[PDB]
Every structure is written in C-alpha cells, then in structure tokens.
Short mmCIF file of N, CA and C in Angstrom, two decimals:
data_model
loop_
_atom_site.label_atom_id
_atom_site.label_comp_id
_atom_site.label_asym_id
_atom_site.label_seq_id
_atom_site.Cartn_x
_atom_site.Cartn_y
_atom_site.Cartn_z
N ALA L 30 0.83 -1.20 0.00
CA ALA L 30 0.00 0.00 0.00
C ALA L 30 0.86 1.26 0.00
N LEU L 31 1.80 1.35 0.94
CA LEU L 31 2.70 2.50 1.03
C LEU L 31 3.95 2.26 0.18
N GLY L 32 3.72 2.01 -1.10
CA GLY L 32 4.80 1.72 -2.03
C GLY L 32 5.45 2.95 -2.62
N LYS L 33 4.66 4.01 -2.83
CA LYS L 33 5.19 5.21 -3.47
C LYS L 33 6.15 5.98 -2.58
N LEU L 34 6.06 5.82 -1.26
CA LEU L 34 6.99 6.46 -0.34
C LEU L 34 8.23 5.61 -0.12
N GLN L 35 8.04 4.31 0.11
CA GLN L 35 9.18 3.40 0.21
C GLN L 35 10.00 3.41 -1.07
N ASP L 36 9.38 3.67 -2.22
CA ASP L 36 10.11 3.74 -3.47
C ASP L 36 11.18 4.83 -3.43
N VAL L 37 10.77 6.06 -3.09
CA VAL L 37 11.74 7.16 -3.06
C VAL L 37 12.70 7.00 -1.90
N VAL L 38 12.25 6.43 -0.78
CA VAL L 38 13.16 6.20 0.35
C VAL L 38 14.27 5.24 -0.06
N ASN L 39 13.91 4.12 -0.67
CA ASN L 39 14.91 3.15 -1.12
C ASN L 39 15.77 3.72 -2.24
N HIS L 40 15.20 4.56 -3.11
CA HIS L 40 16.00 5.18 -4.16
C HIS L 40 17.08 6.07 -3.56
N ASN L 41 16.71 6.92 -2.59
CA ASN L 41 17.70 7.78 -1.95
C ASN L 41 18.73 6.97 -1.19
N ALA L 42 18.29 5.92 -0.49
CA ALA L 42 19.23 5.08 0.25
C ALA L 42 20.21 4.39 -0.68
N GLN L 43 19.72 3.89 -1.82
CA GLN L 43 20.60 3.22 -2.78
C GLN L 43 21.55 4.21 -3.43
N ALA L 44 21.09 5.43 -3.71
CA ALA L 44 21.97 6.45 -4.25
C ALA L 44 23.10 6.77 -3.27
N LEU L 45 22.76 6.92 -1.99
CA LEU L 45 23.79 7.18 -0.98
C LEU L 45 24.76 6.01 -0.85
N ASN L 46 24.23 4.78 -0.85
CA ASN L 46 25.09 3.61 -0.72
C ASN L 46 26.03 3.49 -1.92
N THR L 47 25.53 3.78 -3.12
CA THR L 47 26.38 3.72 -4.31
C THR L 47 27.44 4.82 -4.29
N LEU L 48 27.06 6.02 -3.84
CA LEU L 48 28.03 7.10 -3.73
C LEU L 48 29.11 6.78 -2.71
N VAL L 49 28.76 6.05 -1.65
CA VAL L 49 29.76 5.63 -0.68
C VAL L 49 30.65 4.53 -1.26
N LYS L 50 30.05 3.56 -1.96
CA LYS L 50 30.81 2.44 -2.50
C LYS L 50 31.74 2.88 -3.62
N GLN L 51 31.42 3.97 -4.32
CA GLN L 51 32.29 4.46 -5.37
C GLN L 51 33.66 4.89 -4.85
N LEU L 52 33.79 5.13 -3.54
CA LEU L 52 35.09 5.46 -2.98
C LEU L 52 36.04 4.27 -3.02
N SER L 53 35.50 3.05 -2.97
CA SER L 53 36.35 1.86 -3.01
C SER L 53 36.97 1.63 -4.38
N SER L 54 36.40 2.20 -5.43
CA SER L 54 36.94 2.02 -6.77
C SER L 54 38.27 2.76 -6.92
N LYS L 55 39.13 2.23 -7.79
CA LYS L 55 40.46 2.78 -7.97
C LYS L 55 40.59 3.68 -9.19
N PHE L 56 39.69 3.55 -10.17
CA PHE L 56 39.73 4.34 -11.40
C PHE L 56 41.08 4.20 -12.11
N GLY L 57 41.64 2.99 -12.09
CA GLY L 57 42.91 2.72 -12.72
C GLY L 57 44.13 3.01 -11.87
N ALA L 58 43.96 3.63 -10.71
CA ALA L 58 45.10 3.93 -9.85
C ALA L 58 45.60 2.65 -9.17
N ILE L 59 46.63 2.80 -8.34
CA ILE L 59 47.22 1.64 -7.67
C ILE L 59 46.46 1.25 -6.41
N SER L 60 45.73 2.18 -5.80
CA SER L 60 45.00 1.89 -4.58
C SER L 60 43.95 2.96 -4.36
N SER L 61 42.86 2.58 -3.69
CA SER L 61 41.79 3.52 -3.39
C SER L 61 42.12 4.41 -2.19
N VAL L 62 43.04 3.99 -1.33
CA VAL L 62 43.42 4.78 -0.17
C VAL L 62 44.45 5.82 -0.60
N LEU L 63 44.13 7.10 -0.39
CA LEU L 63 45.03 8.17 -0.82
C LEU L 63 46.22 8.29 0.12
N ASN L 64 46.05 7.94 1.39
CA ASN L 64 47.17 7.99 2.33
C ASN L 64 48.26 6.99 1.95
N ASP L 65 47.86 5.83 1.44
CA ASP L 65 48.85 4.86 0.97
C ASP L 65 49.63 5.40 -0.22
N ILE L 66 48.95 6.08 -1.14
CA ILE L 66 49.63 6.68 -2.28
C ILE L 66 50.59 7.77 -1.82
N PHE L 67 50.18 8.56 -0.82
CA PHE L 67 51.06 9.60 -0.30
C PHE L 67 52.26 9.02 0.44
N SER L 68 52.09 7.87 1.10
CA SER L 68 53.15 7.29 1.90
C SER L 68 54.09 6.40 1.10
N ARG L 69 53.67 5.88 -0.04
CA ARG L 69 54.51 4.98 -0.83
C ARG L 69 55.24 5.70 -1.96
N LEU L 70 54.52 6.38 -2.84
CA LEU L 70 55.11 7.00 -4.02
C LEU L 70 55.59 8.42 -3.72
N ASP L 71 56.52 8.88 -4.54
CA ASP L 71 57.03 10.23 -4.43
C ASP L 71 55.96 11.23 -4.88
N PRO L 72 56.04 12.47 -4.41
CA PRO L 72 55.04 13.49 -4.77
C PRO L 72 54.88 13.65 -6.28
N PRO L 73 55.97 13.68 -7.07
CA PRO L 73 55.78 13.79 -8.53
C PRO L 73 54.92 12.68 -9.11
N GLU L 74 55.00 11.47 -8.57
CA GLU L 74 54.13 10.39 -9.02
C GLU L 74 52.84 10.31 -8.22
N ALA L 75 52.88 10.73 -6.95
CA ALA L 75 51.67 10.72 -6.13
C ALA L 75 50.61 11.65 -6.70
N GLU L 76 51.02 12.81 -7.21
CA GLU L 76 50.06 13.73 -7.81
C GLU L 76 49.38 13.11 -9.02
N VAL L 77 50.17 12.46 -9.89
CA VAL L 77 49.60 11.84 -11.08
C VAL L 77 48.69 10.68 -10.71
N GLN L 78 49.03 9.94 -9.65
CA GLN L 78 48.20 8.82 -9.25
C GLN L 78 46.92 9.28 -8.55
N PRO K 9 85.72 -11.46 -21.41
CA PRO K 9 86.19 -10.21 -20.79
C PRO K 9 86.41 -9.08 -21.79
N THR K 10 86.50 -9.38 -23.08
CA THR K 10 86.71 -8.37 -24.12
C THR K 10 85.44 -8.30 -24.96
N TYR K 11 84.50 -7.47 -24.52
CA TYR K 11 83.23 -7.29 -25.21
C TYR K 11 82.78 -5.84 -25.04
N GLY K 12 81.75 -5.47 -25.81
CA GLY K 12 81.19 -4.15 -25.68
C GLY K 12 80.38 -3.99 -24.40
N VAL K 13 80.16 -2.73 -24.02
CA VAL K 13 79.41 -2.43 -22.81
C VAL K 13 77.97 -2.93 -22.89
N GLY K 14 77.43 -3.07 -24.10
CA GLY K 14 76.08 -3.56 -24.28
C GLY K 14 75.93 -5.06 -24.17
N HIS K 15 77.04 -5.80 -24.04
CA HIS K 15 76.99 -7.26 -23.93
C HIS K 15 77.73 -7.76 -22.70
N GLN K 16 78.18 -6.86 -21.82
CA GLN K 16 78.88 -7.29 -20.62
C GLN K 16 77.89 -7.93 -19.64
N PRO K 17 78.30 -9.00 -18.95
CA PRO K 17 77.37 -9.68 -18.04
C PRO K 17 77.01 -8.81 -16.85
N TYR K 18 75.75 -8.89 -16.44
CA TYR K 18 75.21 -8.16 -15.31
C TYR K 18 74.89 -9.13 -14.17
N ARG K 19 74.37 -8.57 -13.08
CA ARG K 19 73.94 -9.36 -11.93
C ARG K 19 72.78 -8.60 -11.28
N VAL K 20 71.56 -9.00 -11.61
CA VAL K 20 70.36 -8.28 -11.21
C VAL K 20 69.70 -9.02 -10.05
N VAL K 21 69.19 -8.25 -9.09
CA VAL K 21 68.43 -8.78 -7.96
C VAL K 21 67.14 -7.99 -7.85
N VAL K 22 66.01 -8.69 -7.88
CA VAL K 22 64.69 -8.06 -7.83
C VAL K 22 64.10 -8.31 -6.45
N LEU K 23 63.61 -7.24 -5.82
CA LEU K 23 62.99 -7.31 -4.50
C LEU K 23 61.49 -7.12 -4.66
N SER K 24 60.72 -8.09 -4.17
CA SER K 24 59.26 -8.05 -4.23
C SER K 24 58.71 -7.75 -2.85
N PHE K 25 57.81 -6.78 -2.77
CA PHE K 25 57.17 -6.38 -1.52
C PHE K 25 55.68 -6.69 -1.61
N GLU K 26 55.18 -7.46 -0.64
CA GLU K 26 53.77 -7.81 -0.58
C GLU K 26 53.04 -6.81 0.32
N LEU K 27 52.05 -6.12 -0.25
CA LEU K 27 51.26 -5.13 0.47
C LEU K 27 49.90 -5.67 0.89
N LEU K 28 49.74 -6.99 0.93
CA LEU K 28 48.46 -7.57 1.30
C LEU K 28 48.19 -7.39 2.79
N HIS K 29 46.91 -7.41 3.15
CA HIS K 29 46.50 -7.27 4.54
C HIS K 29 46.94 -8.50 5.33
N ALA K 30 47.95 -8.33 6.17
CA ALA K 30 48.53 -9.43 6.92
C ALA K 30 49.39 -8.84 8.04
N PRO K 31 49.66 -9.60 9.09
CA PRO K 31 50.57 -9.11 10.14
C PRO K 31 51.96 -8.85 9.57
N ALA K 32 52.42 -7.61 9.74
CA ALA K 32 53.69 -7.20 9.14
C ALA K 32 54.86 -7.88 9.83
N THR K 33 55.83 -8.32 9.02
CA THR K 33 57.05 -8.95 9.51
C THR K 33 58.29 -8.12 9.25
N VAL K 34 58.43 -7.56 8.05
CA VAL K 34 59.55 -6.70 7.69
C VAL K 34 59.11 -5.25 7.87
N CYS K 35 59.88 -4.49 8.64
CA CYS K 35 59.49 -3.13 9.00
C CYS K 35 60.62 -2.15 8.72
N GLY K 36 60.47 -0.91 9.17
CA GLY K 36 61.47 0.11 8.98
C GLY K 36 62.23 0.41 10.26
N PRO K 37 63.37 1.09 10.14
CA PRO K 37 64.18 1.41 11.33
C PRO K 37 63.56 2.46 12.24
N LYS K 38 62.36 2.95 11.95
CA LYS K 38 61.75 3.96 12.80
C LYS K 38 61.34 3.37 14.14
N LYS K 39 61.34 4.22 15.16
CA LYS K 39 61.02 3.80 16.52
C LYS K 39 59.51 3.82 16.73
N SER K 40 59.07 3.66 17.98
CA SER K 40 57.66 3.65 18.32
C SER K 40 57.44 4.50 19.56
N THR K 41 56.45 5.39 19.50
CA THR K 41 56.14 6.27 20.61
C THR K 41 55.09 5.63 21.51
N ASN K 42 54.54 6.40 22.44
CA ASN K 42 53.52 5.91 23.36
C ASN K 42 52.17 5.90 22.65
N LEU K 43 51.10 5.66 23.40
CA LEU K 43 49.76 5.55 22.83
C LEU K 43 48.77 6.32 23.68
N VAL K 44 47.96 7.16 23.03
CA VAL K 44 46.89 7.90 23.68
C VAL K 44 45.57 7.47 23.05
N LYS K 45 44.48 7.64 23.81
CA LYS K 45 43.19 7.09 23.41
C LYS K 45 42.04 8.08 23.59
N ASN K 46 42.34 9.38 23.75
CA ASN K 46 41.28 10.35 24.02
C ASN K 46 41.49 11.66 23.26
N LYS K 47 42.07 11.60 22.06
CA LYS K 47 42.34 12.82 21.31
C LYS K 47 42.61 12.47 19.85
N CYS K 48 42.36 13.44 18.98
CA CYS K 48 42.67 13.28 17.56
C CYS K 48 44.18 13.17 17.38
N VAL K 49 44.64 12.01 16.91
CA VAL K 49 46.07 11.76 16.73
C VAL K 49 46.30 11.02 15.42
N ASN K 50 47.46 11.27 14.82
CA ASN K 50 47.85 10.58 13.60
C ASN K 50 48.52 9.26 13.95
N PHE K 51 47.92 8.16 13.51
CA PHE K 51 48.44 6.83 13.78
C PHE K 51 49.24 6.32 12.59
N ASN K 52 50.20 5.44 12.87
CA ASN K 52 51.09 4.87 11.86
C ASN K 52 51.22 3.37 12.07
N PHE K 53 50.08 2.68 12.20
CA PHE K 53 50.06 1.26 12.55
C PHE K 53 50.45 0.39 11.35
N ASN K 54 51.62 0.70 10.79
CA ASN K 54 52.34 -0.13 9.82
C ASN K 54 51.67 -0.16 8.45
N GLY K 55 50.45 0.36 8.34
CA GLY K 55 49.78 0.38 7.06
C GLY K 55 48.88 1.58 6.83
N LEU K 56 48.81 2.48 7.81
CA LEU K 56 47.80 3.53 7.81
C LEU K 56 48.43 4.84 8.27
N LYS K 57 48.36 5.86 7.42
CA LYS K 57 48.67 7.24 7.81
C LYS K 57 47.34 7.98 7.90
#
C-alpha cells in the first residue's frame, strides 16, 4: 500500500550507498586509499596517481 | 672479458614487496612512541597514515 513512499526512500538510500561504495573504486590507480599513495610514491608520481 | 658495454654480463636482484592485509614482519628502522586514546592523533600502525 505504502509503495510510493518506500520507493523514493529506497532510491535515496541506494543512491547514498552507491556514492559511498564508489570510494572503493580505484579508477585505474594503484589503490583507493590516498594515504597509501602519499606514503609509498614520491610526490611527482603521487600527484599523477 | 673483451666485449662491448652492451653485452657485458650483469647481476640483477629483484625485490618483491607484498602489500596484502597481513601481520607485518619486515618493517622500517623507525622507533615507536607511546599511545593515547582520548584525542585526535595521527596513527602509523604499519599500514595507515
């Protein structure tokens, strides 16, 4: 019965969850954690990564 | 012993470092300070800046 409200609630929740999970992606980089990139590679390469 | 520089024998050693989530065994010569638990502090627990 209350489907039209749960619809938008679940849509917003899924949008937020996907926006959070997108942080785990690397986008071709070596790691998703930026602190690891800062601590391992030199700044000239850390900026590019 | 009488050859060009482009054909002289070499001796290469490759070092592989595993960054997987595991208890660290090989570390750096850096020391270790005390530990506080009630304030914003920068931790360096062998894998995290």
